[PDB]
């Protein structure tokens, strides 16, 4: 069992972020779910801290996690099912892009939004 829970890591990360419902907030969620599912929460937490200690901003640290914690190169961006495009947080809207064939988390593709109508948009940082 992890010293830090998915819920608590999310809160710690959220505490460091400006605004609400940004692409970074969504990235926090992707990171925590991947960490929780693969039992890497503590590793992820430490990497977050280490990046901040290097002098990186919190946004930059989240990006660093995707490049430095190996698992984020080895799994595809999560597919998140929603009903319509309005379900996506306002702050994320500006970051939606057509979904390429091979999006990579470590290149900024946070997740894929799959709508009810069958359409798909990627979230890109």
UniProtKB/Swiss-Prot annotation:
Residue limits of the VP35 IID domain?
Answer: 1-125
Cross-link (Glycyl lysine isopeptide (Lys-Gly) (interchain with G-Cter in ubiquitin)) at residue(s) = 94
Q: Which family does it belong to?
A: Belongs to the filoviridae polymerase cofactor VP35 family.
Domain characteristics, as noted in the entry:
The interferon inhibitory domain (IID) binds dsRNA.
Question: What is the annotated role of this protein in its UniProt record?
Answer: Plays an essential role in viral RNA synthesis and also a role in suppressing innate immune signaling. Acts as a polymerase cofactor in the RNA polymerase transcription and replication complexes. Serves as nucleoprotein/NP monomer chaperone prior to the formation of the large oligomeric RNA-bound complexes. Regulates RNA synthesis by modulating NP-RNA interactions and interacting with DYNLL1. VP35-NP interaction controls the switch between RNA-bound NP and free NP and thus the switch between genome replication and genome packaging into the nucleocapsid.
Its quaternary structure? Homodimer. Homooligomer; via the coiled coil domain. Interacts with nucleoprotein NP and polymerase L; VP35 bridges L and NP and allows the formation of the polymerase complex. Also interacts with VP30; this interaction is regulated by VP30 phosphorylation. Interacts with host IKBKE and TBK1; the interactions lead to inhibition of cellular antiviral response by blocking necessary interactions of IKBKE and TBK1 with their substrate IRF3.
Protein's name in the database: Polymerase cofactor VP35
In which organism is this protein found? Reston ebolavirus (strain Reston-89)
Instruction: List the lineage, top down.
Output: Viruses, Riboviria, Orthornavirae, Negarnaviricota, Haploviricotina
The gene behind this protein is VP35
